[PDB]
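Retro notes, item 3 of 5
We never archived the inputs for the zinc ion complex last cycle. Fixing that now. Sequence and ligand:
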Amino acid sequence: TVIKNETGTISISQLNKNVWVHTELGSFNEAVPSNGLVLNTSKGLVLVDSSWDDKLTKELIEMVEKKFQKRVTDVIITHAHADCIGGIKTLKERGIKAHSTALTAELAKKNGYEEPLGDLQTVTNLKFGNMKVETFYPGKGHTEDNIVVWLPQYNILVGGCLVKSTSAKDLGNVADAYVNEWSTSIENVLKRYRNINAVVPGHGEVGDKGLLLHTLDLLK
Ligand SMILES: [Zn+2]
Ligand SMILES: [Zn+2]
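Structure as it came back at the time:
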């Protein structure tokens, strides 16, 4: 089940019961899709990452709140990049709690973005209604602050930008990346979660554990 906006720049696809994937196309150098999650809980909507900017983020929020007729209460920022923290301003003005590690908050500030909470520790478990969410900082990789999100009830891993999609042959922006450490961080994810079912890459189609292996291959 996929749902879009008249424009086709924002779409949400059902992964499981209360887990949907939101994807927005940014307009640069042209369309680059970015993934996030929408968690439909008994106490509101929880998102994993916002969008490229405030306009897209606001549109995304308006779309899901209308679809599920609920308030987006929290958002987990996986790292300080436009495709993830781009709509932080929209979040703060709507009373949406922007969770992040202290490091992500520090880098967000350094990059001219409003500051997220900086509340997430290396391992943080959050439960919204009956929806369980675990955030984990595996170490430096795509960026210094990148974290992954794990949904234990579904064994779904949001690898975010630390994980490349099956068709990706490029690592993307590595100016802020720690290429040599990237591999170790992915192994920490692989060692921590040994029963991964679905894996959501930062960009591209949902896959499985093979995406992490594919990324390690690109890094060799
Ligand atoms: Zn990034
Ligand atoms: Zn990205």
